[PDB]
Design an enzyme around this catalytic site. Structure first.
Site, PDB file in Angstrom:
ATOM      1  CG  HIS A 156      -5.761  -2.690   0.676  1.00 50.54           C
ATOM      2  ND1 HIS A 156      -6.067  -2.587   2.181  1.00 50.54           N
ATOM      3  CD2 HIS A 156      -6.805  -1.655   0.220  1.00 50.54           C
ATOM      4  CE1 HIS A 156      -6.852  -1.370   2.338  1.00 50.54           C
ATOM      5  NE2 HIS A 156      -7.270  -0.983   1.310  1.00 50.54           N
TER       6      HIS A 156
ATOM      7  CD  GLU B 283      -5.405  -4.013  -4.134  1.00 49.80           C
ATOM      8  OE1 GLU B 283      -5.289  -3.288  -3.185  1.00 49.80           O
ATOM      9  OE2 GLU B 283      -4.273  -4.993  -4.482  1.00 49.80           O
TER      10      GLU B 283
ATOM     11  CB  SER C  60      -0.830   0.150   1.209  1.00 45.97           C
ATOM     12  OG  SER C  60      -2.113   0.689   0.986  1.00 45.97           O
TER      13      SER C  60
END
Lengths: 537, 537
Positions: free
Chosen positions: A444, A331, A200
């Protein structure tokens, strides 16, 4: 008094602790300081090197977590808590950790350096999911992780000013990378084989070290998991950084009633505020209601980042670079619950069509009415325009595509075209232990625990297949660190992971089945985000 | 009379007719060919509404096709059947307002459902007398009364100075309407049932059928409608009053005609017919394909508002409608004016040729709109691939002009309370002379519906002979009952109505009816919902 746990780095001596992994011992050096604490007059300032110390410094425990917002959306829910600080907050947080094999490697070992995510507003190198004992033990890796300033402390800029130039969180990272060049040999790491990995905002940070010349001499390879330096959320312009900075100032009473002349006065005032005061108002500076948007993030300053990351990936030369990039299957699911009406972890969030159109103005907050409509019209399944399941899944996909998958596809394409060797992946295994509902799929960050080898801990209650999966992933990552190529030399037929290319666009699925090779990464849909959408503005 | 066939003498409102006995495969049919229904629209009548044919004396001989309306004759490919088949097969004259009737032999005792054919030709060509419109098979095999009329095309039927008395426009539509009125008053003489009149037509014929649906005075003249590969809505079937005036004025200049609409038209009336045909193609605002110079005008008379407006706001309670498309609506005209394309090779094109083709196939598009088309239809895995490009070019033209208009119409009609049946025709004639790459171009279902394969002298395969029977059964079942299904035969799979909720349609090919859902639903959202808005920017 174990001499395996006693190391002399450039600043003096350290004492590690011997930790146990399932299949043997590991040496750990926790909370080593790499910078002067960035406190008082040093808040918002670049980090300076830690001064040498007398005697033997105790490096056997994680140091403080950098000052940051703490999540309280679902208090005591393991899903959210696993990302929350597991140590006291403090601006005195510039510390790193080193896991190495026990006994310390005979020859120089490739090093992995980990960079946590957290939207540039949170995170810590000490979370359980970033525990490097497994990679160190099972694969013989020397693993390093560092704390870096986040939120206002790491990222508040008055661009051009001397006292708050921006990107200091990134410079914290760079100083930890320098620290590794100079010191990792003492732990038997190879400063000549340094691989960055991050997830990330961590992945975005990795991408910035790629695009920032002074970092390039400090590592040799990169892994970007679910994030990129390019795209909607990871950077802001100088203009917009100034705007939020001055607005955060005004909001906390700075300066009294001037108000601002120049940056010097405004910053002086900001330094006098208690950490938690800054953090209280961190979230009130965004220009729109939104998700996957964060107030204080790296800034295009013409310094650390000489131009926009987009400009820099279009023209860079990446000939001697190996890069591994990927995304997870879902995601976008995670942030839906943080501010899209209709979404909750408790029910199944079957939303209405209207909730979907209003959710899109939140998910694509910079989208004009027309762009908004393009997105809706693209993502609606016209055979079932109003089915709530489809609408709920498309919402997730809008956010994931726009923020992660298409930016990643774009980066992978550019890097490959400009000479980098790229491998790409999608991660599709939902951990059995996952505490988020099924409709969120693989959110995520839920791959990290597998790459880090946590399922090898018998006590943690992962299925036995998951343990074998984790072994595979650790092999891919460390093979990638060792050689620039995630493939296993001893091994055949069970297919090779081919490089990603602009022509063939091959990536692999990472799940319990053996590698499957696929072509094109949301190719039609990313053409929309990367080619058409900009043109509509 | 006295010595001739008693079945061939009929009286209609204007006088006496002698028909001819014709051989069909399975027995004789009655044909009355070239019955005049209007005063010849010549001299001072050119551009004016038709006037009913004044009664005549004696027995009018109705044993051969009459003149074809004055029009452009294609010569792109001499001797080539594929184009020759659509070319006039009787003398070109302005005196062309004749119609044709086929009925069983002997005429039926009880009133029989009537099918009225309206030919296509883009509003610039066509003729009721082409072989593929031979009514004898539907008459002989299904016991239908089939009627087909000539109507004025090109300038003669469509040149308009909107508002003037002397060239109001839509007069070709009026010729069609006058023949519908003739059927009301006279068809019973033939054993036709005036209370069961079904309009069917293809391409501009289909758009014609749709105009009659949308125009109140035509409404009482029929009960059911079939539209094959054409719609009154869409980019080519109509022009605004302004645009019609502009093309009419330009055509006038091009032939030497100078306030007054009166003196302009008067001058046009002194020009020989061939002069107007020679300049007919020089008046389009852009280089294009699937655009025609003189088409129905939104005059606020025949068409009280745009077709798009009238489909959205009209009440279609009483209406049963069969609509559909062929597999490759766009392939045919690619060879007329997209560079790269040809009947004589596989027409593999480049990206450059595709981008140019898009400006030609979507001539009204801005740069941004066009880049949206090109983005949508590009395959981003293989964006330079010439086979895909060639097929994408076909799809753009086909979708924009036919498939998506048909979906917009099927949708709006179903929602306004009409019974709609939908098909896609997928069988390529065994005899087709166009190259393979063109698939099933528009118009090549027609010879099946009319049952030409039943003529054993025509070289169709045995499965094509059976397939033709199936289709003739669908069409005449539809005309009979408003339902293409065979009321007993619940054995064969049912063609369900098209509905907005399920968007079902059937495939017509040699295999039994298969049911599919959504008609290019995703792609048509692009053309029908998005692309309009991108043309308000």
């Amino acid at each position: 008094e174990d001499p395996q746990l006693l190391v002399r780095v450039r600043g003096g001596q350290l004492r590690g602790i011997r930790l146990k992994a399932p299949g043997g011992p590991v040496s750990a050096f926790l909370g080593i300081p790499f910078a002067e604490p960035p406190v008082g007059s040093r808040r918002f300032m670049p980090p300076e090197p830690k001064r040498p110390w007398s005697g033997v410094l105790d490096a056997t425990t994680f140091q403080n977590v950098c000052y940051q917002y703490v999540d309280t959306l679902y208090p005591g829910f393991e899903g959210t808590e696993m990302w929350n600080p597991n140590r006291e907050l403090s601006e005195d947080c510039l510390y790193l950790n080193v896991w190495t094999p026990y006994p310390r490697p005979a020859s120089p070992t490739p090093v992995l350096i980990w960079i946590y995510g957290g939207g540039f507003y949170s995170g810590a190198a000490s979370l359980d999911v970033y525990d490097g004992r497994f990679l160190a033990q099972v694969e013989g890796a020397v693993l390093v992780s560092m704390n870096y300033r986040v939120g206002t402390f790491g990222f508040l800029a008055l661009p051009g000013s001397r006292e708050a130039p921006g990107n200091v969180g990134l410079l914290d990272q760079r100083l930890a990378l320098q620290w590794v060049q100079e010191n990792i040999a003492a732990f038997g790491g190879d400063p000549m084989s340094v691989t960055l990995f991050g997830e990330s905002a961590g992945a975005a940070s990795v991408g910035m070290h790629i695009l920032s010349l002074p970092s390039r001499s400090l590592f040799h390879r990169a892994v970007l998991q679910s994030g990129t330096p390019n795209g909607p959320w990871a950077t802001v312009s100088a203009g917009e950084a100034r705007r939020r900075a001055t607005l955060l100032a005004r909001l906390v009473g700075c300066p009294p009633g001037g108000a601002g002349g120049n940056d010097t006065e405004l910053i002086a005032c900001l330094r006098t505020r208690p950490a938690q005061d800054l953090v209280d108002h961190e979230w009130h500076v965004l220009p729109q209601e939104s998700i996957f948007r964060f107030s204080f993030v790296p800034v295009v300053d013409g310094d650390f980042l000489s131009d926009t990351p987009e400009a820099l990936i279009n023209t860079g030369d990446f000939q001697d670079l190996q890069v591994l990039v990927g995304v997870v299957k879902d995601e976008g699911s995670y942030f839906l619950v943080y501010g899209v009406p209709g979404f909750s972890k408790d029910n199944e969030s079957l939303i209405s069509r209207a909730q979907f159109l209003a959710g899109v103005r939140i998910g694509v907050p910079q989208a004009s009415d027309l762009a908004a409509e393009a997105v809706v019209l693209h993502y609606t399944d016209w055979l079932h325009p109003e089915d709530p399941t489809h609408l709920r899944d498309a919402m997730s996909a809008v956010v994931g595509d726009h923020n992660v998958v298409c930016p990643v596809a774009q980066l992978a394409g550019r890097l490959a075209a400009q000479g980098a060797r790229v491998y790409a992946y999608i991660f599709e295994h939902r951990a059995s232990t996952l505490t988020w509902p099924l409709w969120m799929g693989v959110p995520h960050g839920y791959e990290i625990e597998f790459i880090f080898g946590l399922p090898l801990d018998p006590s943690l209650n992962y299925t036995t297949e998951e343990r074998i999966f984790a072994q595979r992933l650790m092999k891919y990552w460390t093979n990638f660190a060792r050689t620039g190529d995630p493939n296993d030399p001893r091994d055949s037929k069970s297919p090779q992971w081919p490089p990603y290319t602009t022509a063939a666009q091959q990536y692999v699925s990472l799940n319990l089945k053996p590698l499957e090779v696929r072509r094109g990464l949301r190719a039609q849909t990313c053409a929309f985000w990367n080619r058409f959408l900009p043109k509509l503005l």
